[PDB]
Amino acid sequence: SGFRKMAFPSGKVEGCMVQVTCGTTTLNGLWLDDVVYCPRHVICTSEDMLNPNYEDLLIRKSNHNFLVQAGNVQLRVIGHSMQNCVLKLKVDTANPKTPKYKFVRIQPGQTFSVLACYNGSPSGVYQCAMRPNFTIKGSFLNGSCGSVGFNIDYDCVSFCYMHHMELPTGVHAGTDLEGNFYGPFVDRQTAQAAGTDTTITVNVLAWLYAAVINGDRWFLNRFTTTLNDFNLVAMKYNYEPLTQDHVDILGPLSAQTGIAVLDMCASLKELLQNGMNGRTILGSALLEDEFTPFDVVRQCSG
Amino acid sequence: SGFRKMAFPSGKVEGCMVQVTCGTTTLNGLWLDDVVYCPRHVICTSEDMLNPNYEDLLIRKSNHNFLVQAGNVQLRVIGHSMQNCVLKLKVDTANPKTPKYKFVRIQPGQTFSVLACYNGSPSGVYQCAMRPNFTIKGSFLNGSCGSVGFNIDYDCVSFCYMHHMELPTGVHAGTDLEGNFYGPFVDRQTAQAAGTDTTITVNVLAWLYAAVINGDRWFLNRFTTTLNDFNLVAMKYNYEPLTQDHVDILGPLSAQTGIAVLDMCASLKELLQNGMNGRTILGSALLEDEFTPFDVVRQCSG
Numbered sequence A, B: 001s002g003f004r005k006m007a008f009p010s011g012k013v014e015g016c017m018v019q020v021t022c023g024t025t026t027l028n029g030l031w032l033d034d035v036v037y038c039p040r041h042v043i044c045t046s047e048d049m050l051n052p053n054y055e056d057l058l059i060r061k062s063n064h065n066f067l068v069q070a071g072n073v074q075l076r077v078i079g080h081s082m083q084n085c086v087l088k089l090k091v092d093t094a095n096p097k098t099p100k101y102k103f104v105r106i107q108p109g110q111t112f113s114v115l116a117c118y119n120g121s122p123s124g125v126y127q128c129a130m131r132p133n134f135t136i137k138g139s140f141l142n143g144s145c146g147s148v149g150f151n152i153d154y155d156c157v158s159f160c161y162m163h164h165m166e167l168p169t170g171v172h173a174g175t176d177l178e179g180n181f182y183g184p185f186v187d188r189q190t191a192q193a194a195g196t197d198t199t200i201t202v203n204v205l206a207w208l209y210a211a212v213i214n215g216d217r218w219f220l221n222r223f224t225t226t227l228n229d230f231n232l233v234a235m236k237y238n239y240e241p242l243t244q245d246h247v248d249i250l251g252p253l254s255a256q257t258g259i260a261v262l263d264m265c266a267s268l269k270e271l272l273q274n275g276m277n278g279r280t281i282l283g284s285a286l287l288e289d290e291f292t293p294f295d296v297v298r299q300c301s302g
Ligand SMILES: CN(C)C(=O)COc1ccc2ccccc2c1
Pocket: A006, A007, A008, A127, A295, A298, A299, A300, A301, A302, B118, B123, B124, B141
């Protein structure tokens, strides 16, 4: 029993974190096979943050301008190339700890673990979700750029996020490992703000099913709803639209608990209207939206 | 910026988890140097567990009755002995991935990371506090016994917890690595219950300090107080008494924010007596007590 926001074991990723230095700037890179991936803004100076021309900055660098340190071992850079917003540094040693891996670009609502690192050394691991406004509510201090987000499936690590920057509201923006940013953000220090965030409705529903599986039923009611009526209500609380795809995805949890998806939708409507009345659900006084339907089944059934 | 419940990187511990099977029972072991540590109740059948005589059941087993698998290899057991409630299995090969480590017993209110495992396979990591009633609020399914808790202090892993059982309210109980239970529990299938719990006051204060550092300031007020008057409020609201030691431990945070500890206790007094007025703190509608002062400093300054 019990329900916790758990992260993936970080060891497979720890063996890949290195430190990348360029000029006075030091941040983290991900060392896989003979390539080190890091954010391209490592090549920016004080004067470059607003309108950097990365092609012009990069053409002026030699391999020996990039210092890559893996533990106490300096790695030799033998080539470099830019792919969108990530730098790919060719190094002369393949990482012997390279796990089974792939790169996947995730969708809003998807969860993953972050290994926060500073100077190539991991600091901590926690679990995150890609918010509907394509930011993450992470925990990052200065020097954390290049920390990565990932899932693990059996022995394969799916890298999905690289941290680039913190926006003014304290949330965080970054790229997939092909260097494409999530959302409308760019690696410039000009004014950009995350769109209004919303609650990930399909995740809240999955988490209500988790509460039921763990033996808590107090929030159910005798009502049902149509999908359109649910969305008309939920949008008034800044909840994401619930689609037929989301209804299909919740099917397995519906079958396991005996509660139809639209019946759980009706319970969620009443919860938004009533609040908790001093109670909790799985130990929270708020509705939790950073567990996916997949996560819930995985943590409850194994 | 940002504040997340953060576990230590788990890689050093993943390299020590093995699968231990005795009879029909499979659970997890901790392989350090040439010893595997696991709960002694692995030798019990379901009827044995009703009233086990462990030294007697242990005499009846031999080395070959313990199958130990490190991933894909079977370790050969060459000796066995009990220390309190943990079984020590001497094996033929020392673990090459043994980290620098010590066995330490933690105090209630202290936190640690839990690496939840199944069939010797690490599956999830999360952060836990030792509750004042000596339980932890974990997430464990069948087969998680032998999962371990730990902290890391400058490349040294301090092992502090081994999981043994779930209580009827769904919280969990276990031992230190020397086999001594945390709390008034026994490894027997008898009627056991968690005692009435209390809230870890010094941790709530630490978390209020973390919120101020992150820009959440609405609960600060003009008032201050004394330990004696505050502890009157603490006792009334089922909070652990604040000692003079707690105030000193909070000293560094009280200086980095400019908010004195008893200045902050006045904010907490007001929150206990009046509630949160529909507001949240660091995205929580409850007062969080599973962050220690050290946890806040390491994440928000370190
Ligand atoms: C979202 N997140 C971190 C995960 O799903 C972790 O991965 C696993 C893998 C196997 C499990 C077996 C039993 C219980 C939980 C499990 C979790």
